[PDB]
Every structure is written in C-alpha cells, then in structure tokens.
Design a protein around this nucleic acid. Sequence first.
RNA 1: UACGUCCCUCUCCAAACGAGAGAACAUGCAUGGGCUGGCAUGAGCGGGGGGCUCGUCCCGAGGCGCUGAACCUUGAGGCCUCAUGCUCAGGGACACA
Length: 154
Amino acid sequence: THYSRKPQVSSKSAKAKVSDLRCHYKNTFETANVINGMPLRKAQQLYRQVLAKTRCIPFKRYNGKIGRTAQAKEWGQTKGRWPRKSVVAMMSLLKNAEANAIEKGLDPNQMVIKHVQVDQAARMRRRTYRAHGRITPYMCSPCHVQLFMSEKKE
RNA sequence: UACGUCCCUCUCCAAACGAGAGAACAUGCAUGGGCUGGCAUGAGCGGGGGGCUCGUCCCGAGGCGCUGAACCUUGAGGCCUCAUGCUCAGGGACACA
C-alpha cells in the first residue's frame, strides 16, 4: 500500500522498500534523493565513494548550518556531508532491488533508478534530563524509503 | 563533439569550514650528505681530598685526554642538486536533453 508511483512497464522494473529503517530521516533524505536519475551502477559507485570520502552527499533541503565543503561543487551546492549510516543502509536496498531484478529475468547493468521517495516514519520515544529537574524529549525520527528502477536499454 | 573546468592526490605566500595561491612524472616527494644555526664537550676507554689490602694493587666524588665531542637542524612547512630511492597507458565527475 506504499508506492507513490508505479512503473511504466512493470515487467521491466524491480521494486525495493524499507519498513522502518532507523537511520535519520534528514540524512537518508539526501543520501537517497541524489540517485533519483542515476543508473544502478553509477548510483552504487557514488555510495562507495562517499564512504571513501572522495565524493559527498549534497544536503539541499535539510542542510541548515552544516559545514560547507569543497566537494559539493559537483552538485552545484556549497555544503554537503558523508552520512555513512544512511549511505550503507541505501546500499542494502540497492542490493535488494537488483536481486529482485535477477529473479524477474532482467540485466541489473541497465537499470536506471526511477522513483526514490523518502518519508518520515513514526518516531521513537526516549528522554533526556535537563537542568533544574526538567525532563524533555529525545526522539529518534526514522524513515521509510522506497524505490523501483526501470530498465532502459538499446 | 571538442577546448576545458572541478573533485580525489601533492605543495603552502592562503586558511574556522569554503575560498585562495600553486603544482600536477615535477629535485615533485622521501631519506641521506654538506651548509647554516642551537646547546656546550656524548657513551666508552685510559692515566684527586683521602681510604683498604698484602714498593705494589684495589675503593673514591671530581678532573684531564681522545673531543668546539655527541645530539638536534624544517617539521604549520631553514639552505644547497649535493647524492641516491620512489612514480610505470594518474583515477572519478561534469562540459553533453
């Protein structure tokens, strides 16, 4: 009940989805929106390069006083980061989507990532202890990621 | 399509981070040598108040000699190509509906 969009040709498109990821929403937002037009192998290349800290993830919406870096001129930004926990959870999802392409009978080297959508999951409640006897919230904010990818060849 | 630009890499006249100046098989980097400076004579070995032993031989801080020795010298980043090592079709992304 979850996919906002459906593929054109569903017999040439493999889906993948995360139930409740427990990464930060505001970092898996930009980790995942950067691969929304990329092929599967160029999107996987980007994530192995964010881990090596050779390329960065551009923070374009939930940036808000992050440090500005020299590597965000690739994306036309000034500030971006290397969110390694949102990166490696998106690598588990690209590996699920290409396993779901092989059992459909499809070549995973021809898959363009159509449709990345990240939405907010239900938050999880903890507690921090402030001065003067106060107790105030310490929420988690996890996320929902979904993607298909449609084959574009010849 | 090309010229190219940017990232990663290297340098520091720049620098909170970006940006900047540069270099990109280049004495470029690494180590060594010499210079230049700093300290103040290294470990080791051998020949003095006194005091043991049976003229001799041992204990003794200090001293003297080899010894302006030894060590340190660019590194947030002194000098000299003075010698040699290391690189082996640099890699990614745009430029490009």
